[PDB]
Every structure is written in C-alpha cells, then in structure tokens.
Design a protein around this motif. Structure first.
Motif, mmCIF file in Angstrom:
data_model
loop_
_atom_site.group_PDB
_atom_site.id
_atom_site.type_symbol
_atom_site.label_atom_id
_atom_site.label_comp_id
_atom_site.label_asym_id
_atom_site.label_seq_id
_atom_site.Cartn_x
_atom_site.Cartn_y
_atom_site.Cartn_z
ATOM 1 N N UNK A 103 0.794 -1.236 0.000
ATOM 2 C CA UNK A 103 0.000 0.000 0.000
ATOM 3 C C UNK A 103 0.826 1.285 0.000
ATOM 4 N N UNK A 104 0.346 2.306 -0.703
ATOM 5 C CA UNK A 104 1.062 3.584 -0.800
ATOM 6 C C UNK A 104 1.150 4.371 0.507
ATOM 7 N N UNK A 105 2.157 5.231 0.626
ATOM 8 C CA UNK A 105 2.308 6.073 1.819
ATOM 9 C C UNK A 105 1.467 7.347 1.792
ATOM 10 N N UNK A 106 1.659 8.221 2.776
ATOM 11 C CA UNK A 106 0.889 9.457 2.859
ATOM 12 C C UNK A 106 1.587 10.508 3.721
#
Length: 31
Positions: A11-14
């Motif tokens: 999953x992508x970061x933020x």
C-alpha cells in the motif's frame, strides 16, 4: 503442478497536513 501466484503489492504512503498604535496626546493649552 502450476506454481503459486505472486504476492500483492504494498500500500502507498501518505503525508499529513497585530494591534493598532495608540492615539497621539492632546495639545498643550491656549494662551
């Protein structure tokens, strides 16, 4: 015997998100 499927991707970061000067004093006084 058919190799197993590859693991799902990660999953992508933020990234999270003056007063006015006082008035001047009054004049001295009429002569």
């Amino acid at each position: 015997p058919p190799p197993p499927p590859p693991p799902p991707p990660p999953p992508p970061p933020h990234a999270p998100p003056p007063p006015p000067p006082p008035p001047p004093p009054p004049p001295p006084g009429t002569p």
